[PDB]
Write a protein that binds this ligand. Sequence first.
Ligand SMILES: Nc1ncnc2c1ncn2[C@@H]1O[C@H](COP(=O)(O)OP(=O)(O)OP(=O)(O)O)[C@@H](O)[C@H]1O
Ligand SMILES: Nc1ncnc2c1ncn2[C@@H]1O[C@H](COP(=O)(O)OP(=O)(O)OP(=O)(O)O)[C@@H](O)[C@H]1O
Ligand SMILES: Nc1ncnc2c1ncn2[C@@H]1O[C@H](COP(=O)(O)OP(=O)(O)OP(=O)(O)O)[C@@H](O)[C@H]1O
Ligand SMILES: Nc1ncnc2c1ncn2[C@@H]1O[C@H](COP(=O)(O)OP(=O)(O)OP(=O)(O)O)[C@@H](O)[C@H]1O
Lengths: 48, 488, 491, 70, 139, 69, 69, 195, 70, 69
Amino acid sequence: QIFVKTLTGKTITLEVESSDTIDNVKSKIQDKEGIPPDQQRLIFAGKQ
Amino acid sequence: EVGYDDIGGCRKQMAQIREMVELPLRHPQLFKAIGIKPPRGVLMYGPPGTGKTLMARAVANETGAFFFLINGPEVMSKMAGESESNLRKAFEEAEKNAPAIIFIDEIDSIAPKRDKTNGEVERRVVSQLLTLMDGMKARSNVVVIAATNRPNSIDPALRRFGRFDREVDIGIPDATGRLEVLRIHTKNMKLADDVDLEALAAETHGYVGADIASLCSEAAMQQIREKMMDNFRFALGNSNPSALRETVVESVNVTWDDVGGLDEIKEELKETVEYPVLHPDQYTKFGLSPSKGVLFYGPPGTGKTLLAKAVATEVSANFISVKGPELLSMWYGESESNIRDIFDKARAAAPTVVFLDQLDSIAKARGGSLGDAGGASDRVVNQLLTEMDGMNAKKNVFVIGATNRPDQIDPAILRPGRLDQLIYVPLPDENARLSILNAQLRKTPLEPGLELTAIAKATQGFSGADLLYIVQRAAKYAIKDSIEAHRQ
Amino acid sequence: EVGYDDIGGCRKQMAQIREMVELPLRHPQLFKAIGIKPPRGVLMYGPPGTGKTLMARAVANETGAFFFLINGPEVMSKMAGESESNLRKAFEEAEKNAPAIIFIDEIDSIAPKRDKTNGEVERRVVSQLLTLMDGMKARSNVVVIAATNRPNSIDPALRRFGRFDREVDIGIPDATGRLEVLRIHTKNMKLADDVDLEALAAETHGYVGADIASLCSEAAMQQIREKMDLDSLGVTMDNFRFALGNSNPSALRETVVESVNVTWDDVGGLDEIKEELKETVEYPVLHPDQYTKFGLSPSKGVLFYGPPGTGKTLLAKAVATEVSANFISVKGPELLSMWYGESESNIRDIFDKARAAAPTVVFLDQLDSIAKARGGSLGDAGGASDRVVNQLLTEMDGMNAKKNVFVIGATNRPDQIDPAILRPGRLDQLIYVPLPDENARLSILNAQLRKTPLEPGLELTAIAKATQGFSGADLLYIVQRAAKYAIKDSI
Amino acid sequence: LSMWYGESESNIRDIFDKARAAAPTVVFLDQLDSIAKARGGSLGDAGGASDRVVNQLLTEMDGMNAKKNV
Amino acid sequence: LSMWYGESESNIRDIFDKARAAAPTVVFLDQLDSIAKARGGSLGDAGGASDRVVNQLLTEMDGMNAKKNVFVIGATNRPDQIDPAILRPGRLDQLIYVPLPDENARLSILNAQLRKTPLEPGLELTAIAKATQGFSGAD
Amino acid sequence: NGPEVMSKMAGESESNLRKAFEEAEKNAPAIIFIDEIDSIAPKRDKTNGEVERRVVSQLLTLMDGMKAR
Amino acid sequence: NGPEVMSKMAGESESNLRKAFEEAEKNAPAIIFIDEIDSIAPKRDKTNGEVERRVVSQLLTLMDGMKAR
Amino acid sequence: ADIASLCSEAAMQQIREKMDDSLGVTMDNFRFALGNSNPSALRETVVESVNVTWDDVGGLDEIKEELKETVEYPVLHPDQYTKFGLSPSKGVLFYGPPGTGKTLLAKAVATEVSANFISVKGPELLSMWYGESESNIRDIFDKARAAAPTVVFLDQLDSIAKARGGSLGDAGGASDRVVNQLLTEMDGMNAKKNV
Amino acid sequence: LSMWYGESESNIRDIFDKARAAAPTVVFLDQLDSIAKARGGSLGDAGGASDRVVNQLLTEMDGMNAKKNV
Amino acid sequence: NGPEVMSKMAGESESNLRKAFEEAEKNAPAIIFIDEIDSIAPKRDKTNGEVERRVVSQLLTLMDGMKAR
Ligand SMILES: Nc1ncnc2c1ncn2[C@@H]1O[C@H](COP(=O)(O)OP(=O)(O)OP(=O)(O)O)[C@@H](O)[C@H]1O
Ligand SMILES: Nc1ncnc2c1ncn2[C@@H]1O[C@H](COP(=O)(O)OP(=O)(O)OP(=O)(O)O)[C@@H](O)[C@H]1O
Ligand SMILES: Nc1ncnc2c1ncn2[C@@H]1O[C@H](COP(=O)(O)OP(=O)(O)OP(=O)(O)O)[C@@H](O)[C@H]1O
Ligand SMILES: Nc1ncnc2c1ncn2[C@@H]1O[C@H](COP(=O)(O)OP(=O)(O)OP(=O)(O)O)[C@@H](O)[C@H]1O
């Protein structure tokens, strides 16, 4: 004719937010982004 | 594209809504002449599926204003960083294209209450709504409309002042309310002349407005299947009504005609539970209004609960069907607490009849002994000595009580502050035996040669439930008379 | 923007709070050549709707200082301890501009007392606020004010010398303070000749100020309700009377805490207990120095027991009307909780509100569920029914005598109660309430006949002479039976 | 039975919902000499608990859905 | 026990260990029927919910010596409602019983609690105390 | 200070502790006063997350490195 | 499958849900088979937290605007 | 794996008292490993079959043939119970003077049937708590189905007439959670692996 | 043996490591009538000592041989 | 040492443990003395966690996995 009562407790979280390895950024630089319409980029030649 | 004429029942509340969200938007200069600011927040509640989301879309298309929508369980499921910017984007876009309304639904999922079970987020989103709503009142044509299911799980900081001050209670419709939505949902189905509308609405008696679209499509699908129109009664036997396993059950439609006799109880129940709920103008100048408690005692099977659902369907109010051992008593403290929220629910849905059975246990709760329980059946009567007379003039509730042992009545429960009106339910005499049994074989297509006066002469000390076995045995052998009629 | 004249009713607390903000900023030379340092923290606390954030914005715009705002649930992070970096970010930004003022509302939401959590990041959040306020060596630059609702849920480390001292309670404007609130809100609305603000504050008990602004707005809704739709509306006296009954006061949290609108002569008979009730808290409040002169503490508790229905709810709530003190309403097993550890702290917060709302009136009903003189029935469980009675017997002894604390009883069983419950010094006067005789049962029916227009041809003592040992509630059953027997033809 | 206190009435109505969901079902109550014997004879502490356990099935006999062939 | 985790005897651990570090410090103990009533009995606690109260009250007795000035006083209204291991030998070998004040002591009680009063000495306080036989100092 | 450490991102509270003890011994004599150390090192049964274990083991390692007088 | 698509991100499970219904529109008749509804929509009596009600609100949203053919 | 630690620890003790090819390992090094062993599997019922003969006990030869005519015939061929429509036995009993060597009688029944033997203790029906008196007595039963053929031993069967009406609020699985399941678990067999 | 849960059997685990790793050992328990309140009394003809600590005691006190010197 | 492993994160602590066993293999005979194994390997069943089976599972496949005599 009796009872059992017990509560609980929690811990939410911690974070660091660590990212961006160096090998991904070196590949991130050597690319293209697009050029409007007529914004050619050119070639050039010389030094015969 | 819905309009004003698509829903009814809450027309008394629909008229006061049209002066709350259309009058400050169409005429904002009327509040300038009176000086005060127009109200910003009005919320709605009730059972879900009475058209809470369809009501906001009806008044939006009938005004031509901007209609912004933020869903409850959608924007709160993010990682507590984009919800505060979505609410900042909500009020900024509504200010740009004024006049505008803002409809939100399921605000209990956004704004819960603070309780002992801490561990949720419960912050950073509703506090963003607090600092956003208290401003913006520089005669801007913007209003916010909230919608929820449980109106008491909301945080009390919202319903204080200036944020959500006006409330409306769109509940279940009446018998004429379901009759109006039956004509709406059957405007396109080519029915015949055999269907009824008043009898089809009266045979439902507990159906929420979302069921009317489902019950019409179930009967229409049955009519399609017979090609390779009274199929509405087939749809009630197949489909389950909404609010399935709650305390709002209504499936037995026994009225005061189907129950006979006991004229010292029918007029003595009309004196107490129909007079303050219909004519309260005389009760405010002739003492205190309500006569809540009433007791029923007598022999077993004397017709106690036969009149329980009969009075509950006469005024068409709610019927709290709490059984005898409903004090579940899983521990030591919740056994006195689970009886209090059902009393507060009776005050919210007032007037509403509440039923109990044999909960008088303070005569056995003597002081200073050894044989006793661990906190139940001796301290739950101390809660019964303080939660029964918790009355209010704006509710006029009433509670019935049926027992079969009037010798164990507590000396503190037979009091005018408790259930005081005790009425002995006697045996049905020779005049009441005909009034009970003839109303029960009304559904039987019987022959009129057999009169029940011979049954009343053969039953002298029989109860009415024992007479119900006689018409059951007469019907069970009429089934056997019908079984041996189609095989030959 | 609002100003100093924007809010009234708290004129004593306005002049008190104006000293600690103007003197460190306008004339700081008074703190020189006196040795001491000007304080920083001001603590406001009270019920919601009293105008805590209104008083904070009014003192900011009237001085032109660098006002700042720190919200409770906003700056509370779980990422990497960002709440500890954003509190010190707000302190250095307020230190860059002189003079400045910051405001932290709902300070109980940010790092409360550790009776529940005790292990989360909020233990290290409050200790960040300890070293931030104590490291404010910049004299006469930053003044911090705070606002909350419960001063007992906060950690007691804030109430110290350095960070947060000089607390002030924003009370309830009862001494014609609601007239000043009605003068502010109704000065912009168009008025008529029949209205009078003096005939509104006397009937609005409580009414901290937020519902008064809701009352004049709802009275404007009743005025525009009759317009079916160049315009002259005004107001009337019936609009405020419509807003009294058709709108609830601040009682959505608890149903009745103030009164039930009774008086002295609503209990039938019992003129002897009306004389003995004048030795209760009506007596020693207006003269408390006589007990210090006579060198003895007053009476602490009077106990009552007897037949049920003889005035243990009418006289129990008549004390809340004869002095209009800070009444509370608590039931017997409603104090009993479902958790075992809450069994001793639930009486603690009730008694802590009694010493904080002095003068107050408390009561008890059905102490047989609370006393339990055997001390727990069987045992064997994780929790027992023995700490609920052994805590109030010691906590009621550890109270100050000059703080208007007392108890009054209402029971029906004189055997379940413990002998130490009826101990002198805690519950002194063993007064059994009696059944009324034939000389007192005439005014029992007259308690209901005061408000109803009874015909004088009917004899008042003819119905009262049918009682030969009845109770005081039984004559209410006659007028309740007559409430449904008088009409009978008007349907 | 009622081992602790009130631990039988919750274990009576817990089978009525699944008796009508997976219909046709029947329920076979057997050996009622432990419940249906105590109405006004046993007046002890176990008799006070006997008055709390017999009204659960007495109200469930007429409170059950009789149209779900149970 | 206000907190359900940890703060049951940890609020007493800074009373036991600091009594020998911050000596002299007198610790008073009362309300004995609300700490170890059902837990120390023959039936005890079954489940491990709150049986963590009768352990630190006993294991801090043998671990404490009389090096510094420590002093504890136990007082209750029911001496038999406490666990008998609190009355173990070596720690409670001196049992002092405070009796009921007799007729020669009840008259000086009325002269003690009437200290700061303007009492007229012409009356007899013995005649009030002579009618008190079963009436204690509370009466 | 106590609460001022551990409020960093991406795990640099250990480098702020390693540079604290390294820069002190470069210009000896030095005094390292750790104020509010109870907000840094709780017990192992009340641990919170993973960055609380990372700063109590950094402090226990770096405390043993001062045996060079 | 129920626990398969919902185990991805919130934006990832939405993109697979949105691209499946627009694919089913252009090849009518089509059958969209969903399994294990109980893992996506459990009862709300003690299941605290709000991560399950995000995806089931999008299922009832996309089941509406497909009325005609 | 414990054998692998037994041979290494006994050989290591032989190296200790040699230096202080001249090596030799005697039996007494393994006798030192017997007194220094590590019993790991202790909280599990014995699954191994035994080889004790019926002539180890004296007398009672009239009851060994009655048990041999009931259970060791259908385990080789169960066609005798199906040619006339019968069922095998579910539970046997022994009663008389207590503790007179009924454990070794329970050991010897697993030899004429050529099967294993499971030794469940007597007062374990009351010593096990709530859940332990129900789930643990059926967690060995399906384990006995995987280890078929086998036999299970029970003792102190006089609790059915004293622990039937369990309604007290002090005991857990020792009062009422035994009588509610022995009527079901004894008839809850599959009649195909012969437990 | 009257400590918190989980440590009430680890103390008897140390005397079993003293039977193996720190041999010899001597075990001694005094005042066997006070421990009967924790062990429990067997009543009637069907009883037993349903105790938390006697399961770890009685099983490993007989499994150790005479060479471990228990 | 014990707490110097837990002062780093999960990535570099496993790389430092692998480097210690490789240099001792070519320098046979060698003694790889580790200290404070309770901080690395506590009782796991009382706190069923993520990092309580991270560094000890990396050690167990490296301790039982090595075989070069
Ligand atoms: N007057 C009316 N009363 C009740 N139901 C109506 C009415 N008019 C239409 N209905 C039907 O009921 C449905 C309205 O349900 P609704 O869209 O409001 O769901 P809900 O669950 O109430 O909304 P929410 O998700 O916000 O709770 C419609 O689909 C419509 O067919
Ligand atoms: N006016 C009446 N008089 C007698 N019997 C009636 C009457 N009306 C209905 N009955 C029959 O009696 C039964 C009512 O049983 P109910 O359990 O509600 O009361 P009861 O028989 O007194 O039971 P209890 O003794 O437990 O209160 C119904 O099944 C019905 O057929
Ligand atoms: N002088 C005044 N005293 C009391 N109330 C006032 C006064 N002037 C206006 N009010 C009303 O009281 C309300 C002020 O409440 P406020 O906005 O401060 O809520 P609060 O709960 O005190 O703030 P916080 O959320 O910071 O605690 C206003 O809405 C206003 O209508
Ligand atoms: N002076 C009076 N004497 C007796 N009865 C009165 C008096 N004045 C009013 N009454 C009536 O008696 C009733 C008072 O009963 P009350 O609420 O005290 O019940 P109670 O059983 O005494 O309270 P409790 O539950 O605490 O025992 C009221 O309903 C009221 O109508």
